[PDB]
Amino acid sequence: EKRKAAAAILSLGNVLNYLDRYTVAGVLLDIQQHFGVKDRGAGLLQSVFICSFMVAAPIFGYLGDRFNRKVILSCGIFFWSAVTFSSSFIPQQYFWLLVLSRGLVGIGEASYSTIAPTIIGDLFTKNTRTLMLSVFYFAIPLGSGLGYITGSSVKQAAGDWHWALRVSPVLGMITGTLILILVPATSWLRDMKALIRNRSYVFSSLATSAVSFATGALGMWIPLYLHRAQVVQKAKDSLIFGAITCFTGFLGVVTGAGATRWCRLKTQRADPLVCAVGMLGSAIFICLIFVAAKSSIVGAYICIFVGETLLFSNWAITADILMYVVIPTRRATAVALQSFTSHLLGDAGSPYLIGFISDLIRQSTKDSPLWEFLSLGYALMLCPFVVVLGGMFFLATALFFVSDRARAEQQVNQ
Template sequence: MASCHENIDEEKGLLAPPCEINEDDGESPSAQDVHDRTGISYTRSIITVGILFYINLISYMDRFTITGTLPYLQKSFNMKDSGSGLLQAVFLCSFMLLAPVFGYLGDHWNRKYLLCIGITLWSAVILGSSFIPDEYYWLFLLMRGLVGIGAASYSTIAPSIIADLFIADQRSRMLSIFWTAIPVGCGLGYIMGAKLTSAIGGDWHWTLRVIPGLGIIAVLLLLLIMKEPSRGAAEQNGQKHTNNNSWMSDVKALLKNPSFMLSMLGFTTVTFISGSLSHWALSFYKRARVLLYRGDPCQTVICQSDDSQIFGMITIITGIVGVGAGVEISKRFRKVNPRADALVCACGMLGSAPFLLLALTLARFSLVASYILIFIGALLLTLNFAIVDDILLSVVTPRRRSTAEALQIIVSHLLGDAWSPYLIGVLSDLIRKGKPESDLLMFNSLQYALMVCVFVSAIGGGFFLATALFLERDRKRADIESQG
């Protein structure tokens, strides 16, 4: 069994090799030392991750319940493609504006109570939006913007809590569990939104009344079970990290961190693609079905299946497999190459580009082939969900982590999925402008617009390759600063 050594060589003032955890022995002494430092047992730490996973899950379920009901919303509010893309943009703009507020508060105040306040307000807004009549589109748009309160609170705070409970490979695994909630929540939201709305005769209002009840359960779990660790407790024996710096000084320090900045830009391309596909995939495949089986009705299973259910299952499976596989591949590759995290992300982005291109191209001729290809592309894309956050936590000191999460949220959504669905909708409308409407034109316009994602995927791979150049140096620098 490996023994645990101090992280600082006092004679030389340098970092010694970190403690190794013998994973075959389960809860090894070094891992137990971590939980002694935090004052929180291993079991309660695992339960805390489970609660944060649940919060992340229901948040994305709400976000993509809207996507699952998009055809009903377009009909109800008489929206064009650009108008439906605006729903996601308004939500994410609010999300971005509130992220730095919660990021700053998360580095200075009690994170447990901040989560409770954010989720309570979020649940109340969602419930209120379910009672908006169809003629008040502007009010529904406003309420969707206010939903960003809850998303901003947990997205900036939850990863820093996990980082304060675990170290090394355990932290990577726990982050992978947390981020698996994104694709699983997306898939469940697709299915629930489409199926529930269809089951109750197209009344989308009722689909928004399920999530608020789940949100109240999350608040109760936080209050009754969760115990917040001290900042940086897992990495320091008895030393508490307090942040007396201003928000601007923390931001300036982060801007000078090349690994953080480049990985953040790489993750921005991920959000651009995932935002575009998650918002428009259902509409794209519905339009493809119209062309494929308009003159020749099909009786096979794929023809009679619901696209929301198929794409929802693809999202869930690729999320569970991709996020977990990314962490495990990176962990093993890291033993021979310290830049493994960034290289795995780069391979995922560069590898997904050709599969996305083929999936969009072949949808006109074969739904089965297109779904298989988009499954592979999405699987490669999700490899980096947890790894990107692991990079952030390893190159940023504990007292700046919530601020770093907030800055990553602002940039990745501002340049990513806050405007990508709207951009795709605008491009689709521009391609059709001035031409006679037809089913083929409806399909082709959206197909050509979505091909922007292929180029963005290649650009993302370049950002992650650049991250690999600085990653090892910035990790050592963060370790030294964390040790004081």
């Protein structure tokens, strides 16, 4: 009953992780009002955060292979919590201090999100491990929902940037202690070469990159698309989309876990297939969004719901695949490179790519609300192709799964 409590504590640490990730996402406009900055100011915040996360993922993966592991995790939690509690004090004259605060939070929670999954993998076994990974990733939509609700409620109580980043840090330090204590006692180029040899791991990383691309592009650009659709047919839409995203994340994790349990109990290659089937079923509904909204009078966009569910169904299953096809002393590096790749090819630049394509499409016709709707519609129909591509990579992983699992067990069991 110590390992189960420790997995619960790591999951709560992840809840706090995403709460600190999305409190600023909630309070970005109020930050703009306080600092007197433009939207490119918040663009700098998010871009610097993702850049620092990407850069500090391989280092913390490297140090997660060799030296103490729980120490790195607790020190990372204390790191971003103390950095945030520090940055809240900053006056209005400098905004780059807030940007550096975003960078430091990025480094700390890159350490956490690169170390914790390997601990949860190392603690448990087949059913308990997949359940605990499902919990660890269920903590994501829960964290985002709490980020939004915290930002809005605190702004209603008192609306400023100051009052946003003061809530989580103390609970962060509490969970840093409760991970340092409760958690049960815990060259690099060769590892990189061995991992890039592993075909299943490569294909799973590419599939995760496509998943992150789709999630970032949809989760940013959809609310504007829905507003344009309501304009064509003839804020709050962001709130509705956020609630939909959180509830669909819950439902997707649940459905993926159940379907994986059944298919594994039947066959031998269930982990990648139950991802691929879900991904393609999600792409179909994501397109069904766009074939809808032509008549929202009857339409209800539920295709977003039943597309996001199926798309999020494969969070924990990809982690399961990675733990299956990578030996214990390369799990940290594998997770780090997976995060780096999924960020680089995914949400780091994907919304901006969609924006560039939307600008290119709208350059033909003279600007019109209906024309904006159509242009952004094509730009966001670009994403279902990415989802289908990720599904095909999941099929390739399904091809190589047993072979690479056996090639891993031959090495380990010696």
